[PDB]
Design a protein around this ligand. Sequence first.
Ligand SMILES: *SCCNC(=O)CCNC(=O)[C@H](O)C(C)(C)COP(=O)(O)OP(=O)(O)OC[C@H]1O[C@@H](n2cnc3c(N)ncnc32)[C@H](O)[C@@H]1OP(=O)(O)O
Ligand SMILES: [Cl-]
Ligand SMILES: [Cl-]
Ligand SMILES: [Cl-]
Ligand SMILES: [Cl-]
Length: 311
Amino acid sequence: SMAQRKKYSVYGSCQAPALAKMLNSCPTFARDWELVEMEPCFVASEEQIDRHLAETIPKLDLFLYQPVSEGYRGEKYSSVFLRNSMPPGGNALSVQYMHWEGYHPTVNSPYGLPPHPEGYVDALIAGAVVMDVDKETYLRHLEEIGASLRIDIDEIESWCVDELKTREVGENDGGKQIDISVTDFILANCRQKRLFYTMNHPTAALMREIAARCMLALGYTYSDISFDQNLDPLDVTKMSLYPIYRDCFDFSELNRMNEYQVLYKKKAYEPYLLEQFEWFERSPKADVSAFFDRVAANRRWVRTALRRAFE
Ligand SMILES: *SCCNC(=O)CCNC(=O)[C@H](O)C(C)(C)COP(=O)(O)OP(=O)(O)OC[C@H]1O[C@@H](n2cnc3c(N)ncnc32)[C@H](O)[C@@H]1OP(=O)(O)O
Ligand SMILES: [Cl-]
Ligand SMILES: [Cl-]
Ligand SMILES: [Cl-]
Ligand SMILES: [Cl-]
């Protein structure tokens, strides 16, 4: 019934609690399923993950999860190890980890550098710092950078799709193919609808879409699927598209590059980008260079933009 709904959990990145929130907002889903919450992979403590292996997972009818490698934090947090503890007759369905750099091709997260309080940094700025390009020069060249990215938009999108398709194979989930994905949807809609606020924070529209695919995988009909349209669980931070590049997107509005939102606060694009320079200049140059090299290695358009703007 209702006090006798089946039990499910959602484990994975920050997208996992967001997906549970979205699913719970569908009355037909909520009629059948009761959430038992699991902390996501980046925050679960050892005590918490131990408890979930012992007490949560063996009681689930459904484990919706994103692939998480053993190398991330250890076996205990890995999707292979967690799903192994499911009871007989339980169902474990993998859900795509949604990552897409196509709106903000200059943005990534620190590797080998201190964590940034906002979680994201502009990697092209890191390259400029290494190249001894001054912050004022960079700010005067935003259009040249955006023009380069615009010329390269198809290459960028092709790579973004390939990264998702490669991950569908599930190497970080013991070689199990990902059950539930939205790759074709993302490519087909990305220029028409804003699908990501940051590379790994889907907007409401994308969260609804993936939640819908989960419901289809569970055997619900298309007509069963409806969500709270006001839910936008990953809206904390909103990266701004660069000038010129932004005009490739149907939704693009204000001010020659929009303000950023970071941790729910608005920040004008000029001070935001100047502060990125200041942040990188605090770290050892060798480490900033290692970071930029790591980002640029498989992202041709990044070095191309730096060269076209600053050579
Ligand atoms: S909801 C956003 C919360 N943020 C995070 O969890 C931090 C960023 N994500 C990750 O570190 C990983 O994606 C997690 C969730 C821990 C899973 O890690 P795995 O070891 O299982 O494997 P991944 O392939 O998911 O991650 C490895 C690196 O690859 C980046 N990444 C994932 N997906 C893509 C796509 N499609 N394109 C490019 N890069 C992608 C991850 O961010 C991660 O980056 P590193 O810089 O190597 O940490
Ligand atoms: Cl059971
Ligand atoms: Cl799809
Ligand atoms: Cl924008
Ligand atoms: Cl060229």
